[model samples]
Target chain A: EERALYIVRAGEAGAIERVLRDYSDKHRATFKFESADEDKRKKLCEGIFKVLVKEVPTTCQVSCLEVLRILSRDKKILVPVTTKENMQILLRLAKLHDDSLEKVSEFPVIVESLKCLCNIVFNSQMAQQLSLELNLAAKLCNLLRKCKDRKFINDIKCFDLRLLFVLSLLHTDIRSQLRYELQGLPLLTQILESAFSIKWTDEYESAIDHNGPPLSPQETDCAIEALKALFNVTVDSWKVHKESDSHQFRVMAAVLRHCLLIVGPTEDKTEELHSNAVNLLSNVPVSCLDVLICPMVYNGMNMEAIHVLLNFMEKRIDKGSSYREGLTPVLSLLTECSRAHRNIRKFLKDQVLPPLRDVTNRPEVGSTVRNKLVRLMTHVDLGVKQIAAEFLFVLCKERVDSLLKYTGYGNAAGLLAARGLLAGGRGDNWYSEDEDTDTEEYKNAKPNINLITGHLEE
Target chain B: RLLLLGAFHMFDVNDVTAIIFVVASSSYNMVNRLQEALNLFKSIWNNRWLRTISVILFLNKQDLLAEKVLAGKSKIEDYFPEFARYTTPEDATPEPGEDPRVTRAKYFIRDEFLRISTARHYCYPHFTCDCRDIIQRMHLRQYELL
Candidate 1:
């Protein structure tokens, strides 16, 4: 019944190979953690953690984590269990930038402890006490440089990101640390990729040939968690003494690329390999980069990536799903990038525009959905609302006569084409530009980008 | 047991006791070339491998750099007025064709190299590869110290 007695007796006698030999025994360990006296609980927790770090990648390690997770989840159990020494012990186990976190195969000892940390973060009442004391944020950030490794999903040791929930108590700074730190995005992504283990598909799914299945509802749940982490602390880590922070801008590009990858089941995530790419538009978007990142984000991936994105926006908005939490920010990016980058605009115009416009209809068979969406977003984000209204206008303004003919409202439809009337009494929402002086210079100044031939050079 | 080779300064591996950094003396041939040479030095000095290991610098092609200065075809001021500004005691008037330019050149180069490395906290012993006897003597001395 006592896992500790089992462990201590075995350790003292050198009878068991490791104090942690069985999964079921961890239950005994958990019961002990819950019942131990306050003074004893801390040492008891550390005792388990010590055995965990002591014999890593051992069969018993997972059981140790199982015990650690149970112990860490309860504030009474976790608060005293971790000492600063145990903190260092946890980092050492992570191997931080020390080549191990990035490498994988066979079995891994790291994630179990990281999973253990996630529990500590989730429940620790005095979270910031350890965070600042250990400078945990910078220590976790050590993984940033390894993004260069960009190993295949199978090669990742991504347990570090397992703490993304920022659930409470210990999580806020840790989340912000990983959130604001540019590397934290990838760190969490690395966890998501590895956790959902694509190779697991080959191992378990009999139809390996069918690309297995969309992330199982459970895996999608994990993916959504990782995306939520990204959604929360998108960074502008690039703020500088000389200039405004491009860090947030760079974060936008990265977040966009990453978001598109997760959403696109199998396509839209690919880009020209940097080796052959003279400029794969990878770093080019830093131009007008501010807009894509303005007030929010716009990073992306390949193939069905666009469809994957378009589908969810359509699905959520059509269904009016509240889980469509960040959908508005996403649409704003499509609007921004489509306007700035000719290539992106072409992709959206040709592929994305029509269906989006179609979403506007059927209130004949349709309803007040479009205006209602704009109205709903108006309270939360004017940028999102403005962009939504503008994109609808952009889609229809070209065929205003047809728009007028089809929607059944002639004069009013054409007036909507101007700055578009969705802004009912919302002040100054009428004109985007202030250059209203009708001098000859002002008249010819603003070029209609769509009318121009060729493309905006990156 | 593993030997992983990539671009320059990617020399960190399992566990290394010493690091050997080789730069051609021709790197000092001109301001443009010297900058490239300096960049490589920055790389090696800043490399994480240098943190743990003793570093030895091999400035190869010392003969070419020395000869070019001796011929008086090379002048530091001509290309790099900033480098030309450096003066050592020997820059005092000397015999024509004596071309102690090489001596002056070496002094300036050594100071500049150290300044760069010291600023970056990348410390190492410097070597001139052109002189075989000096190189052998230096190697013997390092061997003795080691």
Candidate 2:
């Protein structure tokens, strides 16, 4: 019977009717038995119904419609019939055998079958059993993510009201327990790329059609939502790993970096792209900075990459210059990571001081540049102070001597910074009261002195 | 917060005045301690002033003997503390009253420093196994007494 059904679905109508006739001839038992016997007969009837539903070709118009109606009535039988193997066949049939050419109309039936299959997976009690197969869920998601038809995609979006239902099932806590079979790291990357490709293609086509700009606000918003959904899924994956695990932390760092690039300002769409980039950056985990900066410094990426990254940041900061509100969080992240990397010290000496020297000496770059520089300086200066405080706290715990001879250079600056050690003369008023009292020790500390003197001299 | 110890200073007359700093912390919070230590090490490694420096992981709070032993069992000893010492110049002899254990550990650390430093040198003659042989001698002498 199964063989006959397969042949019928394979488009052999004669084979299907032959099998049905043979089945009828073999089952001579009474159709209406009572009690347990009735239950067995009903089961047999359901079995036959499934074969008929699956085998009938859409080209056989009326027969296919009748089979769908019957199967649709009994939702319980729909799910098991649409196993992974059967779904592949259905997908193939949907792609091929278009009744549209003949005006025979099989599209609605195919859509209904798909909808029923989705409904069963989502609403049936068998969902738990189905979701246990991670590969199956992954395959289904990939199919949905890769679906080419815009109308079908839209239909799925609307009809599968719980579109993320499969996603949630795949992302359940128990799913994490089976680590060996987990999908590749590129899963999120692939989804984002696919979605972005579609969006960009649409925008390009629209521009060509209009001989003007790309997508309008509504279209852009849709693209943004699609990208955001992919981003959220990626974030959820990273969240499953404990913060302390280095490998997971690295994976999260890489994902953030990828996201930053993807969400960056695209040509001809500055404002929207920048907003999206800022939103993406805001969602990155705080500890991600440590992971990022560690590799950057260890690999000597700090020397060049930091400058490039800062340049990018400067542009973003200027873009939102008027409000300056949304820029705070990103600026704070950069500031914190910079401090953690000891870039604060280098920046103070090399970047801040030289400029400050010119400013102090000339007093003519105007207050605007000076004010911005000063504001920037505050972040660097405060970072140094915080490091100093931490250094002192550590030293005090270790009971290390506070004397200059015994103090390590880092320790001395840290201790002095912690003690609020300030040099004599020139803008001493700038020093905060919160500064530690160990200022005298760094009086001749070359690096600190050079930075301080250069700043004041400028 | 953890204590960073040791010294960072210029190694040659023409060399930049770099400071090589070492940080030591209890292994209780292994993750934080390792991070802090790596940061300090990386900073010193990148500094333009100091050409070379040695790390000395004191493995402090050994007074917490049980904790220290447990930490050691977990192979925390295999990390920073194990790399604290360095090989001294060949002609140098041990000073009076120096604990052999401390001296040997320092030699081991110094040897590691030399190994890394030499490998990094642009044109300097690569020191051969002679230094390592001396390190072996120091190791034997230090552990033989135990």
Candidate 3:
């Protein structure tokens, strides 16, 4: 209680650092408060905001912004911190000078200010509306473009992505504005491309192998943030397109190139990057997903991005960590792609279900990725089970007989029952009527077997 | 101190080697308890060791279900729209002298539970309140596994 007054008073002397440090450290765990504490929080936030807007030293400004950000973490204090004028000041400090005269020296002040703004915009709808009206998201996207131009791979660039993600996530209208109005799709995708050091050139390098070194820690962090922001911009982006290689297609090509190349310095970072990329891919318009395998085959490569995605999917299933959260997005995207694109279906089917050879084991028993995915058909999570079953169903061409062949009557029953296909039939007429290629083992075991258990008779 | 205790306990799948998912199949007062039953069924089947463990679905309240079906005030297809298209399997052997409508409705509910079973793990289904039949089948399944 004494320290709050001391810090507010110390703001005038520009020497609040020592006491603020001690106060925050002391109250880290015991920061509980009553009415008097509420009054202090208001005074303390106001004091910091006043000092932050003044012509203080860079260290003083950064320290003030840091405290403001920390103090605003509580929603109660966040309300006072989210005033229209305060957001404007945060935006200005975050951008500092104009585009041409921006200085690297002022980045610490800008980064701290942007972090504070992110917390405010993320929590407070009032701040979100104020930020939107002030056109701060457009400014941040422009700042991102400038960062790409100058090759500024630093904290300033990363925090801009963070703030932009918060803005695009909380405000749905901003998503449309960012995608079309601000050129955000290509901009964020370009940043991801640069982070991975890949280009959407004519040669169409194979994304399956991603023949590059792992990203630096800073690059990985920035790439993941950009991927998250891009997800928000693309997630409900349903638009009309007449041309084959439209604007979204270009970004999709860039995104696919980074799908496998977006490796991080560590395994955890790598999975995070891959997860965000897949999450973004899941939101991309179904029509635009055709961009992934548009040319059918490039450089004599069988659409490596599709293979990379399948490989990533298999790894997640084999790892079997949080299957509901981890696997559903990727599985849904693959199902949509398979439905829209025939060649993608052929490719994924070749990888995941390749004319089953071992009919001896139960559908979910073998170590193959298909077996692992089959196990998810009975998973507790409804969405996980539904998406997993749909992915296999699409791969099986949505034929009841075909689905039954691989997953057996037991595993294939859920999707069939839901779709009213338990009586039996094929889906729409889109499926190719290729001749069935039953293995000798499967054909021989078919007669004396139980379809429910998918095994030999007792 | 002596006290009379009336308690319900939930067991983790880890504590048991097998699971019997008993669902209330009547719409009379059952309201669609099938959703919760199916949800719990899938979740129990999701367990690591219990995934391989035997599961038998005991569809309770068939007598009530038949009563509702015959009363004709409420219809099966009203709650479960898929019941309209559901036809009893041609080869299914019904209990002696049961109505086709009752058979169709009960089997529709049974197939709802059957569809969620994994290919490796078969979920054997039986109709309501036959305690002797349930135990006898459980013993036979255990013996068959052995």
Candidate 4:
């Protein structure tokens, strides 16, 4: 019946919906004998679904939406019918009738189809029975690229949100396989640009006027989250390029920086978006930070866009205000984000810090300025302590004393003993006084050396 | 079918008795004779009756040795001494139904002939075909005798 429908390209308007309803109805029936012969029934239902998809006019916008809806179901009938081959067929259909494909506004159903396809193609457990041909990945890329282009012009908002969700699912499955491919990047950029443009244009206010409720927070979050994920994937791909491809690298870096600057923060932005933006910035992978940071700083980004980063840094400092927090932005922006031609950190340390320190140290310096310098020093100290502690802990445990030997700290040789952080040594007392002394005299005589030693001694 | 019956009986009774004949006009012709011999062996193998048949190839132009065999004189002298010293079985008398050359032919095919052919193909650099055609003859007789 399905083969007939497909061949005739007739009665396919709501054929998918009808078949799904019938299949669901049949599956729900409690007939014992009928249930026992479920496998045969399933095969027939699958055949019907396959015909609905294959025979239905792909250009028939309503039929395509209906077919996508039917295929999105979790039932076995849908599973077999939505094979990789079927996915390719649908992708081809979408490609050939690009305008019709764009007209289908049943985004939820299309997203579901994409999810199902991703699960089958990428997930080992779900797709164990299926073997995908190499061209399927390329075909999916092509189809998605077209869908993205169409969405760019028509229903830009929905396209931005839906494609993001779909690409994320695709990334989950084929990140390793498709990471080298360039197809996903441009589409991602398009979605991100559209998302930023919408946010820039406040298009959602008009969208809300027509679509009933204002754009939900969830919808907004989803759009930003998708852009973040896409940016991450793009940066990840850029990392794999050879050094000779400096031009491509620079372009990607500039685009990322621009996206970062544009999508930095808004009053309604979610914490997830903030973190993702930071994550996107931190994970640029290539040395384009100099290009990004200088421009951002020059444009008064310190007061506007960079406050989110500074706020994040402040919170991180509150947790453990290491010199790392102070250095992270400067170093990351200079080295990792912008490909600096000169040693930015050395210049800051040698040429900048000495004079600044000297100015702050003047006898005529005000208390507030002194306090600020002290606070800066405290953060720097914290960073140094954190890094030193980490290095020491690793070295002591791993018994790799050679790395610490040359650092010129007096207690380098006896780090484990001097710090009282490790056990099984004879040099200084390893255990605290509490562990050693239960008697009152011993506590009173030295006032428990372990408790009072380091800071109390000072 | 007649040959099959005879071969089957020979295998059934564990009788290692069979002979194959080869005919050629000269010592050089003997090479062609051997080629035909191996082809016949392959045919038997294709029929799945190789275990049943014993083959012995005869180069029948020994009488033309002085003229046609001269070009191949060294090869003949170095190789085909067995034909010149052909012998019958020592213990078995020529019974009414029994062919007299059956034992000698079996010995020649199983113990002499196949060795030299295999040596020529495989061990050409080191092969010493003395009076004993040990390797090839042993290979040819192995399946039938079993």
> Measured against the native two-chain assembly using Cα atoms, what DockQ does each of the candidate structures obtain, in the order listed?
0.00, 0.01, 0.03, 0.00
- Candidate 3 structure quality by residue, lDDT tens digits, A139-253: 7767776676564547878887877766766677887788777877667767766766654445444344437566788987887778777666765544555674366565665
Better of 1 and 3 by TM-score: 3
i-RMS for every candidate: 36.7, 26.9, 22.3, 47.0
Model 2, A40-80: lDDT tens digits are: 33344345444544546544433433343333334344555
Best by DockQ: 3
| Global lDDT scores for all candidate models | 0.43, 0.38, 0.65, 0.37
Error of 2 at A296 (Å): 14
Decide which is better by lDDT, 2 or 4: 2
lDDT of 1 at A257: 38
Candidate 4 on A56-131: residue-level lDDT in tens?
4433443334333433333443455545566555444434224245354445444434444443333233342332
The TM-score values for the models, in the order shown, are 0.43, 0.31, 0.72, 0.40
TM-score ranking of the models: 3, 1, 4, 2
Q: Chain B TM-score for each model?
A: 0.60, 0.31, 0.66, 0.30
Error of 1 at A134 (Å): 2.5
**Which prediction has more favorable TM-score, 1 or 2?**
1
Best by TM-score: 3
Estimate, for each residue in B1-146, the C-alpha lDDT of model 1 and write its tens digit. 11222121124335443344556655554448777766766776677755533344445566787677767766677766786556664322232222466657766766667777666122333333411122123322322100
Candidate 3 stretches greater than 4 Å from native: A1-14, A24-36, A96-102, A151-153, A200-211, A239-245, A290-300, A319-321, A354-359, B1-121, B124-146
